[PDB]
Structure 1
Amino acid sequence: SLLAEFGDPITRVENALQALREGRGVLLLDDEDRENEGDIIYAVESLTTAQMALMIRECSGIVCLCLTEAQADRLALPPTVSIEAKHGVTTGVSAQDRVTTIKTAANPQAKPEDLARPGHVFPLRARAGGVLARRGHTEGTVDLMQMAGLQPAGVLCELTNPDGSMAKTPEIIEFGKLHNMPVLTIEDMVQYRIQFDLKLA
């Protein structure tokens, strides 16, 4: 298979988790199909301006903040939503300001009044159960953070070739090599969680 050289599914997940623990990004696909498009995922815990700058210049720019249901509830988000930190920003759209918004929104101590709407960051609620309930990249992002033992919030954005076409699996693989970002799939994550999160007795 197209990703087989990079480890079996569980190894790909393990490698992705270790990259996140080290503060590095990963690349997420639905599965190994050649025509899949993919996302850069960063942990919010270790998110830097330079990472956000990379994400914006390499991706769609429509940067999504993936949150638990509990964290979105803490923000009084509705059950397109967009947000901006009330404080600590200027015009909201710079890489630094988006990181500020993201850190503010993902803070477990956050209150709704910490944010203004609308803004340049797009929050998304992960389903309870994660990829075992819904195979979305929103669930994938939050599950990865939880599986890595990190703050359960991550940012995602769609990798875009410079000519404006979306990066497909082959291009995502090459981007992963260039930027040393492990590539994994939602299918890999499901296989991992079925193996390690389920009761066996």
Structure 2
Amino acid sequence: QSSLLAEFGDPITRVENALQALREGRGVLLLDDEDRENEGDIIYAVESLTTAQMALMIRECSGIVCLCLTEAQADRLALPPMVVNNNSANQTAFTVSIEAKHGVTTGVSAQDRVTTIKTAANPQAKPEDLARPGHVFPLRARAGGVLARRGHTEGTVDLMQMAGLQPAGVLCELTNPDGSMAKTPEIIEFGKLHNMPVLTIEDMVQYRIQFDLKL
């Protein structure tokens, strides 16, 4: 995999290019550990999220689009874990699903999802702004980010913080047309086609440690 990602640059470059894409309002592709999910997620910053970016995720990914939030923001929204005794294989920190209370119809159109996501990520948001259940799936990122938990959830929020953006992002798993999940060759090819930088959680952990970067 190492050599596959070489063309995107050394790990530090890979991280710096992803941060700059995010600052520019573009998306990135994040791979977790080969020994974990070995999946690539499209990641976008909520701040600059557009309907066309949401539509791309829905067309090209699993369609189960997740909103990665700080613990603080999730608590502000009064979003408890979806299940108390999470026995999923990674303990993915799904809250109950959400829908904007206002400004949406059925909730599932690209525009409606963006409306819900922006409503939820608003630092001035209140619980009553969101109906439950709905068609956006919030995830609670662990305090400490990828240095505490090597999930895409933490990678997403960490990327936003490292980039100086509002600490909220969306993710969704890149899927091949035939329904199988994209593996690294397909992710790199998709990244070239859509001018999206590629990086790994390992890249982020290396980077954060070496630049004594608490967030």
- Give TM-score, length-normalised by structure 1: 0.95
RMSD between superposed Cα atoms in Å:
2.0
Which of residues 118, 124, 130 is equivalent to 2:133? 118
The offset of 1:199, in angstroms, is 8.8
SS of the residue 2:34 aligns to: coil
* C-alpha distance in 1 between matches for 2:38 and 2:70: 25
Distance 1:63 1:35, change over 3 A: closer
Asked if 1 retains the 8 angstrom alpha-carbon contact of 2:99 and 2:107, the reply is yes
Instruction: State the 1:125 CA deviation.
Output: 0.4
Report the CA distance shift for 1:34/1:81 in structure 2 as closer, same or farther (over 3 A): closer
For 1:70 and 1:84, the matched residues in 2 are separated by 19
Structural mapping, 1:45-194, within 5 Å: 45-79=47-81, 81-194=96-209
The answer as to 2:210 corresponding to 1:199 is no
Aligned to 1:98, what secondary structure does the other structure show? helix
Structure 1 residue 36, shift from structure 2 partner: 2.3
- For residue 34 of structure 1, report the CA deviation from its aligned partner: 12
User: Is there any run of 5+ residues in structure 2 with no aligned partner, and where?
Assistant: 82-94
C-alpha change, 1:81 and 1:10, in structure 2 (3 Å) is same
- Seen in structure 2, the aligned counterparts of structure 1 residues 140 and 199 have a Cα distance that, compared at 3 Å, is closer
Any gaps of 5 or more consecutive residues in structure 1?
none
1:131–1:140 contact (8 Å) kept in structure 2: yes
Q: Secondary structure at the match of 2:196?
A: coil
What displacement does 1:2 show? 1.8
Contact kept, 8 Å, 2:57 with 2:63, in 1: the verdict is yes
C-alpha contact (below 8 Å) 1:43/1:153 kept by paired residues: yes
Cα gap change, 1:123/1:4 in structure 2, threshold over 3 Å: closer, same or farther?
same
8 Å CA contact 1:34, 1:168 repeated in 2: no
C-alpha deviations, 1:6-54, integer Å up to 9, x for none?
Answer: 1111110000000000000000001468992210000000000000000
For residues 170 and 35 of structure 1, the distance between their equivalents in structure 2, rounded to whole angstroms, comes to 15
SS of 1:149's partner is coil
Query: What is the TM-score normalised by the length of structure 2?
Result: 0.89
CA 2–70 in structure 1, closer or farther in 2 if over 3 Å, else same: same
Q: Do 1:3 and 1:32's aligned partners in 2 also have CA atoms closer than 8 Å? A: no
